[model samples]
Target: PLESQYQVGPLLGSGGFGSVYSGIRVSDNLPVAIKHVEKDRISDWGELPNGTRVPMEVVLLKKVSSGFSGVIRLLDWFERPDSFVLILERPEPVQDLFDFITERGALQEELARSFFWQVLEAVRHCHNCGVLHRDIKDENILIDLNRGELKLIDFGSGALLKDTVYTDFDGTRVYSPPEWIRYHRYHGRSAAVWSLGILLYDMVCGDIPFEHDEEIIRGQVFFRQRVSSECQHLIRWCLALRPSDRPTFEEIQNHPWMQDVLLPQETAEIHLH
Candidate 1:
């Protein structure tokens, strides 16, 4: 059925928990990222309002299916007897943000601010759409080398946005907030803010601030290779041990650090084959 509707091509890379294929849509020349995940490997299953059981990833993906800013849009999905396949909008000549960041070493605060702005835009989009992107790491982000646009991906650890506390986490450990370390429970927005800070640290400082849970609980962050004062301030504020002390996404948007940077679109490379 998948082959009938699309021409599946070569392997792209190892998927989060399955396989990813490069493919072409049948009706259009639109390229897509095809993911095949075995049912048994799924971490959580959710029941739709109409009682259709599906992976929580699919639920979250559908909830925030629209995007223009910096996130992936699910084009389609298929439920198989023993597996599920997701069709995602793919940006050509893109690479994971972490891979690009690694190659360039730490980004200057000037460039870092531009990337961070769009990331926050996309994160806020998910929150506004009532979806919590639980896993918000740089590796889960993509940047188009041909242009300079960014996108957040992987809904595998996502859930419906809720104010209720979560006792279990599906995100990266080092990116986990101090509240989760202290009480084993975390609020979605606050925890999300923490990971946003972690991403910023990685962008301007070259790596995550915390290594183990204890350090995360300690909530002590350090800068390296001369990160700018404003960048350091935002990083520390976001990494505040008290989750409630973290800036609201709006506050982050208004921060002085974000004001001086060029609009993300202006920072792009015009064209490159």
Candidate 2:
């Protein structure tokens, strides 16, 4: 017999894994995002250094949530007869960064600066913790406009870092670094920096810098909107054609644009639901 511990709500969205549902925990009625994934859909079953054979996504999420400030929390999970149910912390009154950008085209420099700093901090935290969010597109972020808060979500495309080269491309092509596309392999940090550069453009300029993959490979970025000089410098540094020229997350935090903003102390203060 199945135990009744939670009530599943409406379908939130669907993707390559399966579907995500809004749900409530019966014990405390805490709202959560319940993800249902068919057993067969999951391809990666790599074990962590600890020797526990689990989904790479699960391992990454567990590791990041422990000390990272802006990652989504994994509350609980269960393996059913056919599918796996992942209970994740769902922040209330939150919107995907993609939709937020769509509604507010080209945010002001100050606003963009604040958001970008949070993202830089989040990414720095991940890298320090030995994880790489291979997919760093705008869609993977959740935002609370009222509090100026951000949460980095969607670890399905993430991987544990071992200072090795990654050849397989699993993230969005539009956000990919030119080196990865051209050489079929790239390092984690450099690829992440490239994506951050693209994300910053999307936030402040209201659209991506390139229209096609070839344009990215060509290494030309046109800034349609007027951004601050400091902001421009940071973006250019991140988008440098040579991966070695790109700044690390720690270095990015010291950029003039990111230096002036005061970020939220506790990532928990920014939540949905």
Candidate 3:
């Protein structure tokens, strides 16, 4: 029945859980990404504050997909005795931000500003919906270069808005905020903004702000490339020594560089087929 409804294509990639494939719905030829995960490998299920048990990724995606842009929409899923399959929206001909940056070495400041704004908008939307995307990095962001659109992917490392304190440290260490490294605990929104800062610098300079957590905790980031004073100022504000000093997502959205390319606030609702 699963193979009958969707024509699964070649393997996209594989990891500890299972694999993802390029696929299309037989009914409408709608493009989709199919991920197959071994059921036994999933140690435990995630629960909301109300105690409703579900995969953390599924919960976060379902919540955010209701009316959020720049997020990969989860269409549906199927469960087998041995595995769980996820049918996800596959933006055609899109490239991960990682490869996109590699091809260009470094994007123009204007382009960087545009991409960063979209990313910030995505993060803000997620936070508003009570979802914390603990992992915010280039590899998880997909971009349609021709159209200048972006989508945030990979929610396996995400969690519901439980509290300000996080300790497990599931995401990539290099992108973690200084506080997380030093104290092994960090607030949700502040850590997200810190990751965005690192991403912004990566986009504009084609390099990470700091190579290690030690440098990140030291608060000794240095900018090698020439960027506008406004852009430089924003980066510093995001990488502040204390999370309290970093600008809020709303403030980041309102900064001068972001104001110039404001996109209309369009609702991103998911439609069932």
Candidate 4:
């Protein structure tokens, strides 16, 4: 029991090695999302001599997220000698961007612009904190319907910015930047920016730019000269094959595209909370 004091209510969901449940703090009855990790998910990744798991989730939750609105929030977590228990804020009517993209056509440009701007802001904040959230796909960003906040969650793949160059294979394919495809590991803020471009395109088009062929995908990205030039100027700047060419957070914020574009107050302060 590890002297655990919370009271769990009912099962919410299950993954390979864990289950989420509705729980209540014994003292206050405040609701919590309890992730119960079984021995299996832990053993597959690696293990402790005493069998406790790594603090992957905790390390991620501590990082202050950048411009994400409606993202999930973390509450508390504790490790037992044998298992891992994480208590998260339980938000009702939550949905990741993927769900919206799949169900609806491309998001309205106004909405995409609003969400994209916020996401970039949050990402900028992460960079300022010297953290890199290498994974930026729709699934990793959550929407909190309860408080109307978007909070970026999950940091298993996140790393300190100084530890940028890695040889490890990481990041979701849908949102992985081109450099990751080129080198099998991420480069830096540039990789994140490129993926952000692709994600924005997906938000606007309801499908990826080069989902048809890998070559086209790579070519359109690396050889922007040969593609449609309408938005290519800005897009290429954001998706520059090299990390150095991509725009910095300031450049992105000052760009004409984001200027004067207002959004709901709930989404505007996504990163602040």
| Candidate 3 backbone overlaps, count | 0
TM-score to true structure, per model: 0.94, 0.91, 0.90, 0.75
Top candidate on lDDT is: 1
Tens digits of per-residue lDDT, candidate 3, 1-273, equal: 799999999998787856999999998899999988786666546765566655667777888887465898889877687877889988777789898889878777767777788888788788878888989999999875445678898887888776658787688888999998899989888888899889998988898989876798897768878888888889889999899999998899888877676232221111000
Backbone clashes, each candidate:
0, 4, 0, 13
Query: Candidate 1, after superposition: displacement of residue 232 in Å?
Result: 0.4
Task: Return the TM-score for candidate 3, rounded to 2 decimals.
Answer: 0.90
Decreasing TM-score order of the candidates:
1, 2, 3, 4
Candidate 3, position 22, lDDT: 97
> Candidate 2 at residue 212, lDDT?
87
lDDT of 2 by residue, 110-210 (tens): 66777788888788888888888889878889885446578898888888886788988788888999998799989999999999999999999999988
Compared with the true structure, all predictions reach lDDT values of 0.85, 0.81, 0.81, 0.62
Give the residue spans of candidate 1 off by over 4 A.
270-273
Look at candidate 1 and tell me the lDDT of residue 216: 91
Question: Which pairs in model 3 have colliding backbones?
Answer: none
Per-residue alpha-carbon lDDT of candidate 4 for residues 74-142, written as tens digits (9 for 90 to 100): 666666656777777665556667776787766665566677777787777777766677788676666
Query: What TM-score does candidate 2 reach?
Result: 0.91
lDDT of 3 at 169: 68
Model 4 Cα shift for residue 172 (angstroms)? 0.7
Which pairs clash in the backbone of model 1?
none
